[PDB]
Design a protein around this ligand. Structure first.
Ligand code: FES
Ligand SMILES: [Zn+2]
Length: 130
């Protein structure tokens, strides 16, 4: 609902629980309420709100959609990278790759995933309908 201050993309709400799991611990005192996640590949911003912006360099976690080179995480619960997904998609086809990597099968995404959401959105963005 809130728009990224850098790229204008609508972000999705994330709780302090999620933000604290992904930002460098030295920045925890700056986490004072909800943030919004910027999912745009080109934008340096990862979390933003009225008070504070955390860019890629302020996170301890690599955010898959923001990374140009491997490792490019997609599923954080099951430790699946873009490379694993496309390697397997070439061998077994995109649908059997999702099934074989285990991407999307976890439940702890609000903490493991920087977006605070299940990795389906990124899987779908990559052409792996789930
Ligand atoms: S991040 Fe993929 S199932 Fe949680
Ligand atoms: Zn942005």
């Amino acid at each position: 609902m809130m728009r990224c201050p850098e790229c204008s993309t609508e972000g999705w709400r994330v709780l302090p629980l999620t933000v604290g799991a992904h930002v460098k611990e030295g920045l925890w005192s700056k986490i004072k309420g909800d943030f919004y996640f910027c999912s745009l590949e080109s934008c340096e911003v990862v979390y933003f709100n009225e008070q504070t912006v955390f860019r890629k360099g302020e996170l301890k976690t690599r955010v898959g959609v923001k990374e140009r080179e491997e490792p490019k995480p997609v599923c954080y619960c099951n430790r699946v990278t873009e490379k694993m997904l496309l390697e397997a998609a070439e061998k077994f086809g995109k649908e059997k790759a999702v099934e074989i990597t285990g991407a999307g099968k976890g439940k702890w995404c609000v903490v493991t995933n920087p977006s605070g959401r299940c990795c389906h959105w990124h899987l779908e963005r990559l052409g792996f309908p789930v």
